[PDB]
């Protein structure tokens, strides 16, 4: 039962398969499919409650945006500035700039930049024709500066459903909505977020590979104080098994989302996301919610995500106590060499 | 300059050397001598202040007890119970019984027992003649139950000097005085204490080998939750260099103390103590003081003993947070494998 996203769905009106295997990149690990269910299906509510991924096919979450495309957006999205990452590779590794101080030997593989939507659309058209290899990925939180047409679409989202989801799971507040527009083949390397996420696909298809919190040992996140904190150190395209032995034991949950699908990415779950090759641009809007608070009474043993919370904290504390994050490793090693390993 | 305790001191009245090399056990590491100074010497006050060991030859700290011997003690020490450890080896590894729950696969190498002084003196005489190999070490905090003669000796200690030492170093309170009587050849394996110690030799000679806090990496203490917490895991008689590689880089400060000497053992300093072979029984009384409080403002970088304080705390916290000390190691390893090592 390790097929992956399964047999490519067939579009209504005999419009052919939505995409085919040859558009998916190749990796060294097996994966099983994430369930695709109706939001009225109890099994889906069971998955959301037990914090497991599930693709919801009929939430109508971002019904109003399904009509969005570059042309329409350039038109009414507003005059604000949009963050746009550029890279010479398909991999868009995220790096926290605030943390770039702690690590100087770190050379960003992708540089961010501000611009007006029309400029992004332009730099995009520019590359497209000139046969360029440069890559772009616009990632911008939706704010006040957006057009009224866009604000109307926004109000049109299925708030009744999501708000009830937030209520049912005791989640905290919606912290933001990230608008993501990217070129086909673009890849966001495996990482995990400290929040609950309802990932709404709008245009194009995205293959989503998730790993549960308990595979922390196989994914090897960077040190908490490094800029790529929360991202996996393993290059999925050329895994170094000498440095990352347990990546040979990794198993993912996979799926391909399209216009109308909503992928629940539970807090702490690793996820690798890619826009299909030759699938054209992709558009997604995510909804990030602070997770519920730590229970009054802790039950033992601890869940995997709780142990991850503890490790991050130990790393943060040692960083402040020692007065320098670069000392964390030597201390940690001194503490275990010949004592716990 | 790695001789050790140096040339054996000559006793007053041409009474020959106090002891000779052949009474010292053999070890794989080099050592340099701990300074022997007059307590009126400024260099000694400098060492105590900068927290470095120093043997003080004329404090008159326990002047009144210099006359103590088994006979006299059996006579006036009182009726109380005395803790007495027994072992089939010369090594008396200390183990915290409260912690024996956390580790069941731990089999004590020495068993404690209560008895009246006269009984200890008896079990001692018993072995001595019957040509036994069993070993004994009486270690007992001095309390109310002691005889008036003993209480008079006690009041006779040089409180004026030590109390001023406590005052000068901002130390906390005297927590106890451990009376230690042991058979020649007896060994107390390397460990460190969380308190300041003025170690007063009374009868017999003891070779003291100290290692500074910064050799934590070469001495490999047991995990904080193990019964032998604070003791070194390395068998000094047959060091396992495969498990404890850095023990090949250890360097000690050594000395031999006799009746009248007071060895300042700074808090956190490792110390291995042995009664000379064929030196007859030994008697020592130590004075344990809580160390000064953490400074208002921490200066960076941290001193070695502060990093040791931090590691112990991390281990203690992880133990409670995970609800089980046995999980500390796996968590620690998961946290560093492929991330910090």
């Amino acid at each position: 039962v390790a097929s992956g996203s399964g047999e490519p769905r067939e579009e209504a009106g005999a419009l052919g398969p939505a995409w085919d295997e040859s558009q998916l990149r190749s990796y060294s690990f097996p994966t099983r499919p994430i369930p695709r269910l109706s939001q009225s299906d109890p099994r889906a509510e069971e998955l959301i409650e037990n914090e497991e991924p599930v693709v919801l096919t009929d939430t109508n979450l971002v019904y109003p945006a399904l009509k969005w495309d570059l042309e329409y957006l350039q038109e009414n999205i507003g005059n604000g500035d949009f963050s746009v990452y550029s890279a010479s590779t398909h991999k868009f590794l995220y790096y926290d700039e605030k943390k770039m101080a702690n690590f100087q030997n770190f050379k960003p593989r992708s540089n961010r930049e501000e611009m007006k939507f029309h400029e992004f659309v332009e730099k995009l058209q520019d590359i497209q024709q000139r046969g360029g290899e440069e890559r772009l990925y616009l990632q911008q939180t939706l704010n006040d500066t957006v057009g009224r047409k866009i604000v109307m679409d926004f109000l049109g989202f299925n708030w009744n459903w999501i708000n009830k989801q937030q209520g049912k799971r005791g989640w905290g507040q919606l912290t933001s909505n990230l608008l993501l527009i990217g070129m086909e083949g673009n890849v966001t390397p495996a990482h995990y977020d400290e929040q609950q996420n309802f990932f709404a696909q709008i245009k194009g298809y995205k293959r989503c590979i998730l790993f549960p919190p308990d595979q922390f040992e196989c994914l090897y996140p960077y040190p908490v104080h490094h800029p790529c904190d929360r991202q996996s150190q393993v290059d999925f395209d050329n895994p170094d098994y000498e440095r990352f032995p347990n990546f040979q034991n990794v198993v993912g949950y996979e799926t391909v989302v399209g216009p109308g699908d909503v992928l629940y990415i539970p807090m702490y779950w690793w996820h690798h996301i890619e826009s299909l090759l030759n699938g054209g641009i992709t558009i997604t809007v995510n909804f990030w919610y602070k997770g519920a608070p730590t229970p009054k009474r802790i039950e033992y043993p601890l869940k995997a995500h709780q142990k991850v919370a503890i490790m991050r904290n130990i790393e943060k504390m040692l960083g402040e106590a020692l007065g320098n994050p670069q000392e964390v490793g030597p201390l940690l090693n001194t503490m275990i060499k010949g004592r716990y390993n | 300059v790695a001789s050790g305790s140096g040339e054996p001191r000559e006793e007053a009245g041409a009474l020959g050397p106090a002891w000779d090399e052949s009474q010292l056990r053999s070890y794989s590491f080099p050592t340099r001598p701990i300074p022997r100074l007059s307590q009126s010497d400024p260099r000694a006050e400098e060492l105590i202040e900068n927290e470095e060991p120093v043997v003080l030859t004329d404090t008159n700290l326990v002047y009144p007890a210099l006359k103590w011997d088994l006979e006299y003690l059996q006579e006036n020490i009182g009726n109380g119970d005395f803790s007495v450890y027994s072992a089939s080896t010369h090594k008396f590894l200390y183990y915290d019984e409260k912690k024996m729950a956390n580790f069941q696969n731990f089999k004590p190498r020495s068993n404690r027992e209560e008895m009246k002084f006269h009984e200890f003196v008896e079990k001692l005489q018993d072995i001595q003649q019957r040509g036994g190999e069993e070993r004994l070490y009486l270690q007992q905090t001095l309390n109310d139950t002691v005889g008036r003669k003993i209480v008079m000796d006690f009041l006779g200690f040089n409180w004026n000097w030590i109390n001023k030492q406590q005052g000068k170093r901002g130390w906390g309170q005297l927590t106890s005085n451990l009376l230690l009587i042991g058979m020649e050849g007896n060994v107390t394996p390397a460990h460190y204490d969380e308190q300041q110690n003025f170690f007063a030799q009374i009868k017999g000679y003891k070779r003291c080998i100290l290692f500074p806090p910064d050799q934590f990496e070469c001495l490999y203490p047991y995990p904080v939750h193990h019964p032998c917490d604070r003791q070194s895991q390395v068998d000094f008689d047959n060091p396992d260099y495969e498990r404890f590689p850095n023990f090949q880089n250890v360097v000690g400060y050594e000395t031999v103390v006799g009746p009248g000497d007071v060895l300042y053992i700074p808090m956190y300093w490792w110390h291995h103590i042995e009664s000379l072979l064929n030196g007859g029984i030994t008697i020592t009384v130590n004075f344990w003081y809580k160390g000064a409080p953490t400074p208002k403002r921490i200066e960076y970088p941290l001193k070695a003993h502060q990093k040791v304080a931090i590691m112990r705390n991390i281990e203690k916290m992880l133990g409670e947070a995970l609800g089980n000390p046995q999980e500390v190691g796996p968590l620690l390893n998961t946290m560093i494998k492929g991330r910090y090592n």
Binding site: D96, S176, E194, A309 | -
Partner: peptide, 10 residues
């Protein structure tokens, strides 16, 4: 305490 989480995202 050590179980407390923060809230970071890409």
């Amino acid at each position: 305490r050590l179980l407390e989480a923060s809230a970071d995202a890409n």
